[PDB]
Amino acid sequence: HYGIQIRSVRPDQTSQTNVLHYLNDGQVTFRFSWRKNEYLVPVVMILKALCHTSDREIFDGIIGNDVKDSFLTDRLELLLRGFKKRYPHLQNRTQVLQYLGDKFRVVFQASPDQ
Amino acid sequence: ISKPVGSEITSVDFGILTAKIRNLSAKQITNPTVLDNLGHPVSGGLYDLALGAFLRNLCSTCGLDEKFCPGHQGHIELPVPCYNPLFFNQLYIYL
Amino acid sequence: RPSALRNALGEAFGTKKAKKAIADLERNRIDSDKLTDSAIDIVDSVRTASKDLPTRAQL
Amino acid sequence: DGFTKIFETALNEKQITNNRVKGFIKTGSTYILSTEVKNILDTVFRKEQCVLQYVFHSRP
Amino acid sequence: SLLIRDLNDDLSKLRVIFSRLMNAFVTIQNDVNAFIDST
Ligand SMILES: [Zn+2]
C-alpha cells in the first residue's frame, strides 16, 4: 500500500506526477503517465541513467550512516542485486539510455535520426 | 365513463416470434436513407408510408391520417442469421 | 502500425499487457485452410436471402 | 469473447487418437461462422425434443 | 446488409475478398448486437 508521490511542475506551470512504489520483494518501481497510458520502470534503471554512478554512490546516498541499521541494508540488496541479475547487459550510463530509449521509442514520437 | 369496455385482458403469454413475421408485414425496408430531396419519404426506406401516416401524407396501409393511424411494423431482412444477443448465453450452453 | 510498440510487454500497465493477448487471440485468421478452402458453400446460400436489396447510382 | 464471436479451439493430438479408434469402426482456434451453429443446434433440438419440451415449458 | 450484397456479387463471377466477407459477418453481427443492446 506504500509509495512516495511527487508532483513536479515545469517552469511553464505544466505538471508531471512521478509515483515511487514499494513491492514486497525489496523491489521499488517508478511510475509515470505519459500520453494517457502508464509506465512502470524499475528505479535503479533511472538511478544508473541519470548520472555516472557506482553501486556504492547509490548505497551511500541511501545509507548515509547507520551501516548497523539492519532493516535498510537488507531491503537494498534486493534492489541492487535485483538490477544486476535482471539487467546484466547494462554497465554504464550510455548503455542503459540505449535500453531506455529503445523501449520508449514508439511512444515519444522519436524521429528515425535520433 | 360513458364509453365502457367489454372484453378485458387477464393473462399475458411470453413467446418468441418465428420466421413468419413476414406474414404480418409485407412492407420490407431496403433503402437505408430515410428521405430524399423535396423532403419526401423514399419508398423501401425506414420512413415508408406503409408504416403509418407521416409528413401530412396518408398511410399506405390504413388509409388514415396521422391522428388515427396506429402505425404498422416493417421488417429488415438480415442476409445471414445472426444470433439474438439476449438468448446468446442460452445457446452457448446448448452449444 | 501493427505491433511495433511492444511497450506493454516491457514496462506498462497490467491490463494494457492483457489487451495485447486479447487483440491477437480474438483476432482470428479469416484466411485459414479450414475456413477459406470450404467457403464456396457459404456464398451458395446467401444469395437466397439477399435478393430484394437494390443497388443503383442514378439518384 | 465479448458476445460477438465463438471459437472452436484445437483438439489436442492426444484426443484425435482417442477419436479414431472408434470412427474407423484443425489449426489453433478456428472461427465458427454464425450459420453453422444453427445447423448443429437444429439437429440437436430435433433429437432431444423430449427433454427440451419440458426445459422450455413450465405450464403443460 | 447492402455492403454484404455488394460483395455477394464477388463470387458469381469470382483470398482477400473473404477477409472482407468474414469481416462483414462480424460487423453484421456487431450492428444487430448494437441495435438491441449498446453495452
Ligand atoms: Zn396507418
UniProtKB/Swiss-Prot annotation, chain A:
**Ranges annotated as spanning the membrane:** none
Highest taxon of source: Eukaryota
Q: Which residues form the signal peptide?
A: none
Instruction: Kindly list the places in or outside the cell where this protein is found, as annotated in its UniProt entry.
Output: Nucleus, Nucleolus
What is the recorded function of this protein according to its Swiss-Prot or TrEMBL entry?
DNA-dependent RNA polymerases catalyze the transcription of DNA into RNA using the four ribonucleoside triphosphates as substrates. Component of RNA polymerase I (Pol I) which synthesizes ribosomal RNA precursors. Besides, RNA polymerase I has intrinsic RNA cleavage activity. RPA190 and RPA135 both contribute to the polymerase catalytic activity and together form the Pol I active center. In addition, subunit RPA12 contributes a catalytic zinc ribbon that is required for RNA cleavage by Pol I.
Subunit annotation: Component of the RNA polymerase I (Pol I) complex consisting of 14 subunits: RPA135, RPA190, RPC40, RPA14, RPB5, RPO26, RPA43, RPB8, RPA12, RPB10, RPC19, RPC10, RPA49 and RPA34. The complex is composed of a horseshoe-shaped core containing ten subunits (RPA135, RPA190, RPB5, RPO26, RPB8, RPB10, RPC10, RPA12, RPC19 and RPC40) where RPA135 and RPA190 form the DNA-binding cleft. Outside of the core, RPA14 and RPA43 form the stalk that mediates interactions with transcription initiation factors and newly synthesized RNA.
What further fact does the record state? Three distinct zinc-containing RNA polymerases are found in eukaryotic nuclei: polymerase I for the ribosomal RNA precursor, polymerase II for the mRNA precursor, and polymerase III for 5S and tRNA genes.
The family this protein is said to belong to = Belongs to the RNA polymerase beta chain family.
Designated name of the protein: DNA-directed RNA polymerase I subunit RPA135
Source organism of the structure: Saccharomyces cerevisiae (strain ATCC 204508 / S288c)
Q: Which gene encodes it?
A: RPA135
Q: Describe which stretch of the whole protein the shown chain covers, with first residue, last residue and complete length.
A: 231 to 344 of 1203
Curated annotation (Swiss-Prot), chain C:
Q: Which residues carry this modification: Phosphoserine?
A: S32
For this UniProt entry, which residues form the secretion signal? none
- Please state where this protein is localized: Nucleus, Nucleolus
- Taxonomically, the superkingdom here is Eukaryota
Q: What functional role does this protein have?
A: DNA-dependent RNA polymerases catalyze the transcription of DNA into RNA using the four ribonucleoside triphosphates as substrates. Component of RNA polymerase I (Pol I) which synthesizes ribosomal RNA precursors. Besides, RNA polymerase I has intrinsic RNA cleavage activity. The heterodimer formed by RPA34 and RPA49 stimulates transcript elongation by Pol I. Subunit RPA49 can bind both single-stranded and double-stranded DNA.
Oligomeric state and interaction partners are given as: Component of the RNA polymerase I (Pol I) complex consisting of 14 subunits: RPA135, RPA190, RPC40, RPA14, RPB5, RPO26, RPA43, RPB8, RPA12, RPB10, RPC19, RPC10, RPA49 and RPA34. The complex is composed of a horseshoe-shaped core containing ten subunits (RPA135, RPA190, RPB5, RPO26, RPB8, RPB10, RPC10, RPA12, RPC19 and RPC40) where RPA135 and RPA190 form the DNA-binding cleft. Outside of the core, RPA14 and RPA43 form the stalk that mediates interactions with transcription initiation factors and newly synthesized RNA.
The Swiss-Prot or TrEMBL record describes its family as follows: Belongs to the eukaryotic RPA49/POLR1E RNA polymerase subunit family.
* Protein name per the record: DNA-directed RNA polymerase I subunit RPA49
Taxonomic path: Eukaryota, Fungi, Dikarya, Ascomycota, Saccharomycotina
The encoding gene is RPA49
From Swiss-Prot, chain E:
* Localization, UniProt: Nucleus, Nucleolus
The similarity comment for this entry is:
Belongs to the RNA polymerase beta' chain family.
Q: Anything else the record notes?
A: Present with 2840 molecules/cell in log phase SD medium.
Its function, per the record, reads: DNA-dependent RNA polymerases catalyze the transcription of DNA into RNA using the four ribonucleoside triphosphates as substrates. Component of RNA polymerase I (Pol I) which synthesizes ribosomal RNA precursors. Besides, RNA polymerase I has intrinsic RNA cleavage activity. RPA190 and RPA135 both contribute to the polymerase catalytic activity and together form the Pol I active center. In addition, subunit RPA12 contributes a catalytic zinc ribbon that is required for RNA cleavage by Pol I.
Subunit annotation: Component of the RNA polymerase I (Pol I) complex consisting of 14 subunits: RPA135, RPA190, RPC40, RPA14, RPB5, RPO26, RPA43, RPB8, RPA12, RPB10, RPC19, RPC10, RPA49 and RPA34. The complex is composed of a horseshoe-shaped core containing ten subunits (RPA135, RPA190, RPB5, RPO26, RPB8, RPB10, RPC10, RPA12, RPC19 and RPC40) where RPA135 and RPA190 form the DNA-binding cleft. Outside of the core, RPA14 and RPA43 form the stalk that mediates interactions with transcription initiation factors and newly synthesized RNA.
Q: Report what the protein is called.
A: DNA-directed RNA polymerase I subunit RPA190
What does the organism's lineage look like at the top? Answer: Eukaryota, Fungi, Dikarya, Ascomycota, Saccharomycotina
Q: Which residues of the full protein are shown?
A: 393 to 441 of 1664
